[PDB]
Amino acid sequence: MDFRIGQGYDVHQLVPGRPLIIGGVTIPYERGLLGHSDADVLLHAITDALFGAAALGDIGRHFADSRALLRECASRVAQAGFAIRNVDSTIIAQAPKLAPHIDAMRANIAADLDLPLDRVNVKAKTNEKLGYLGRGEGIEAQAAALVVRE
Amino acid sequence: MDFRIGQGYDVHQLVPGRPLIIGGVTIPYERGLLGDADVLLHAITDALFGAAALGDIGRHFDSRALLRECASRVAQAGFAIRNVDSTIIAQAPKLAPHIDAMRANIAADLDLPLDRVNVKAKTNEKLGYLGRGEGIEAQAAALVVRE
Amino acid sequence: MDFRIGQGYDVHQLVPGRPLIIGGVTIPYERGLLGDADVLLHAITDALFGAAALGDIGRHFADSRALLRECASRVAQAGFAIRNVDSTIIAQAPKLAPHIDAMRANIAADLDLPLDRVNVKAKTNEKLGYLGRGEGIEAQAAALVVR
Ligand SMILES: Nc1ccn([C@@H]2O[C@H](CNC(=O)c3ccncc3)[C@@H](O)[C@H]2O)c(=O)n1
Numbered sequence: 001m002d003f004r005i006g007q008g009y010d011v012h013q014l015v016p017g018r019p020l021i022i023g024g025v026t027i028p029y030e031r032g033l034l035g036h037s038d039a040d041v042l043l044h045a046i047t048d049a050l051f052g053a054a055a056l057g058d059i060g061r062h063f064a065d066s067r068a069l070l071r072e073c074a075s076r077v078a079q080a081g082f083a084i085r086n087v088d089s090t091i092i093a094q095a096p097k098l099a100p101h102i103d104a105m106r107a108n109i110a111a112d113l114d115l116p117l118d119r120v121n122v123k124a125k126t127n128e129k130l131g132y133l134g135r136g137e138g139i140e141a142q143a144a145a146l147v148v149r150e
Numbered sequence: 151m152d153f154r155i156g157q158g159y160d161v162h163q164l165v166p167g168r169p170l171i172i173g174g175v176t177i178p179y180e181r182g183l184l185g186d187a188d189v190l191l192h193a194i195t196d197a198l199f200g201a202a203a204l205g206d207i208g209r210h211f212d213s214r215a216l217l218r219e220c221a222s223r224v225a226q227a228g229f230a231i232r233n234v235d236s237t238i239i240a241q242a243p244k245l246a247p248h249i250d251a252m253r254a255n256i257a258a259d260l261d262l263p264l265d266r267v268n269v270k271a272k273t274n275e276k277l278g279y280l281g282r283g284e285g286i287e288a289q290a291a292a293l294v295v296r297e
Numbered sequence: 298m299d300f301r302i303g304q305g306y307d308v309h310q311l312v313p314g315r316p317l318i319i320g321g322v323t324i325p326y327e328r329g330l331l332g333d334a335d336v337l338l339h340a341i342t343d344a345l346f347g348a349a350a351l352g353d354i355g356r357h358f359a360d361s362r363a364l365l366r367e368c369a370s371r372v373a374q375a376g377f378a379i380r381n382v383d384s385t386i387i388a389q390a391p392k393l394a395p396h397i398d399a400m401r402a403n404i405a406a407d408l409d410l411p412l413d414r415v416n417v418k419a420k421t422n423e424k425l426g427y428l429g430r431g432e433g434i435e436a437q438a439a440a441l442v443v444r
């Protein structure tokens with residue numbers, strides 16, 4: 001009965017000489033995301049949505065392999081007494097084509113959250129050529145999570 | 151009971167010689183959306199696929215027909231739609247007097263009562279491509295239950 | 298029972314000559330938001346009206362905290378109890394972490410929630426766009442309610 005929702009936002013710059021890692025998937029591409037960690041923009045947004053659902057603050061309060069961060073986030077959410085019910089998310093990127101990699105992202109997140117595949121979703125959008133996202137200056141992710149307090 | 155949430159995002163450019171169509175409503179305006187490029191129905195569509203964990207709009211496919219088909223697929227995965235909430239971000243034109251008709255369009259397409267469908271509008275305070283009137287963005291959130 | 302979700306978005310310009318007020322907290326900074334222009338409370342207000350399918354902040358509507366209290370009252374009177382709120386402030390500067398618990402406390406008090414049902418997060422924009430250049434501040438909110 002004790003359901004809670006969270007939401008998460010993250011953006012990183014796209015620079016050359018970094019490998020591209022979104023949703024724990026290394027995607028072949030001539031640029032990658034810039035950050036202190038591996039800068040996995042999708043995992044960061046999801047981590048934030050989970051801490052938010054559980055009212056545990058945010059990713060900078062708590063915390064690098066972003067999958068390990070995601071698993072520790074999930075561990076702390078479980079320790080606060082919440083079970084995760086579902087995750088949805090959107091990646092907004094001009095390039096590259098993310099469709100061939102989506103199911104793999106979905107699978108990594110399921111694994112890290114200990115959820116079946118059917119409770120995790122990843123969507124991909126272009127920004128229709130508008131703003132810094134449209135110019136391919138960075139990649140944004142958005143996330144939503146529903147949890148319930150056991 | 152087995153609740154799930156989804157979230158949707160869409161943006162489209164504003165261009166000359168296109169009708170402005172948002173939430174199924176034709177709004178008098180010098181320019182319209184490129185793509186019927188209905189940004190609001192697209193966001194809601196993605197929010198619903200996301201909640202049912204069915205992927206996204208481009209993995210599946212006018213916008214009202216597509217919103218109807220999304221609803222069909224959501225029910226096919228065995229979910230009922232509980233509510234939809236959404237925001238349109240447009241510097242111009244004024245959307246307020248069309249919002250109720252958008253809600254009515256959406257409620258009909260999703261076979262939902264009016265009180266389970268919401269549409270909100272914001273400017274972007276003259277900031278960015280939104281503030282300059284170069285595009286219109288929509289955001290949506292959807293709650294479903296596996297019945 | 299009858300759960301519903303709302304989402305909210307808000308943005309304001311950051312200029313000198315205005316004080317910075319986010320989540321009801323006055324934050325010392327060379328610049329502030331143009332509108333009391335409380336970007337966080339506006340977004341949360343929008344998210345609550347959205348969950349209750351009551352339109353948006355402009356249709357209903359004093360400082361932003363009284364507006365939030367009136368919002369919650371109307372949400373109650375519509376048959377809904379607030380279950381939780383989560384949110385994100387996106388600002389390149391200044392550092393918001395020290396002010397987070399104050400913001401949560403104001404929101405919780407205004408909604409009559411226990412603190413552990415209100416969350417506020419902070420993010421930079423990695424120096425991208427008008428947000429990353431310190432030209433505005435954005436807030437996003439999600440609200441869960443039940444009838
Ligand atoms: N204006 C701000 C912004 C952030 N933070 C705190 O600083 C933290 C790290 N920065 C990030 O914004 C970030 C992390 C991961 N990926 C991309 C960006 C943030 O999580 C918040 O706790 C803060 O105190 N004040």
Ligand SMILES: Nc1ccn([C@@H]2O[C@H](CNC(=O)c3ccncc3)[C@@H](O)[C@H]2O)c(=O)n1
Pocket residue numbers: 093094095096097098099100124125126127128160161185192206207208209
């Ligand atoms: N980087 C990306 C981006 C998108 N897609 C896939 O390409 C699809 C279409 N593009 C749209 O972004 C879109 C659709 C409708 N309205 C506005 C925008 C998208 O849904 C995703 O499945 C992808 O494979 N890789």
Ligand SMILES: Nc1ccn([C@@H]2O[C@H](CNC(=O)c3ccncc3)[C@@H](O)[C@H]2O)c(=O)n1
Pocket residue numbers: 240241242243244245246247271272273275307308332339353354355356
């Ligand atoms: N294109 C639009 C945009 C908005 N509105 C109506 O104008 C209202 C207020 N303006 C704001 O967008 C706003 C409020 C607070 N902070 C920043 C911005 C809005 O809530 C909606 O009712 C409208 O009718 N048409």
Ligand SMILES: [K+]
Pocket residue numbers: none
């Ligand atoms: K945005």
Ligand SMILES: [Zn+2]
Pocket residue numbers: 010011012035039040041044045
């Ligand atoms: Zn990040």
Ligand SMILES: [Zn+2]
Pocket residue numbers: 160161162185187188189192
């Ligand atoms: Zn679209």
Ligand SMILES: [Zn+2]
Pocket residue numbers: 307308309332334335336339
């Ligand atoms: Zn505002």
